């Protein structure tokens, strides 16, 4: 559940970047393909995003690392499927 986002503001200390990081993550869960890193208590993708932020496993650096990993996986998939 969710009442305040205060710990998520503590771990991403800008309070304006929290919205952007959790929005990037909640778009990775909504359309999205991806599955959450945290157990869901029938919370929506907003609260699951912020709840991933509070326990310190999603920030901007982890999302860019995962997207570089997916870009390398697509690169290796294209190279190993064609050649």
């Amino acid at each position: 559940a969710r009442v305040t986002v205060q710990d998520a503001v503590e771990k991403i200390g800008n309070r304006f970047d929290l919205v952007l990081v959790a929005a990037r993550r909640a778009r990775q869960m909504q359309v999205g393909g991806k599955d959450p890193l945290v157990p869901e208590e029938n919370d929506k993708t907003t609260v699951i995003a912020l709840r991933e932020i509070e326990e310190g496993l999603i920030n901007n650096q982890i999302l860019d690392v995962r997207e570089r990993q997916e870009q390398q996986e697509q690169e290796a998939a294209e190279l190993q499927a064609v050649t």
């Binding site: 919205v19 929005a23 909504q30």
Partner: protein, 99 residues
Amino acid sequence: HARSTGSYSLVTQQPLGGKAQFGGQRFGEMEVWALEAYGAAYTLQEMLTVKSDDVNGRTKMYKNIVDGNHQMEPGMPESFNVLLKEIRSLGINIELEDE
């Protein structure tokens, strides 16, 4: 009273006003200043582009909601292009510059 989507005016692309006309709430000037007072840049962007005026934005948004994709494709408000044609209908050459 409540409104999700219905009819609008003629001159402008914004929703009608009142209850006898099935219309939405005027999100006035001081509410825009109150959203600027927070960091509500995306809430204000859908508050004056998708929810109100931009016709391509609101049809894409209704289809995006009912597909299950909360995402806005904003575009430019229609009443600002109405402003451009009313200013341009003077002897004034107002434009929109480089990419």
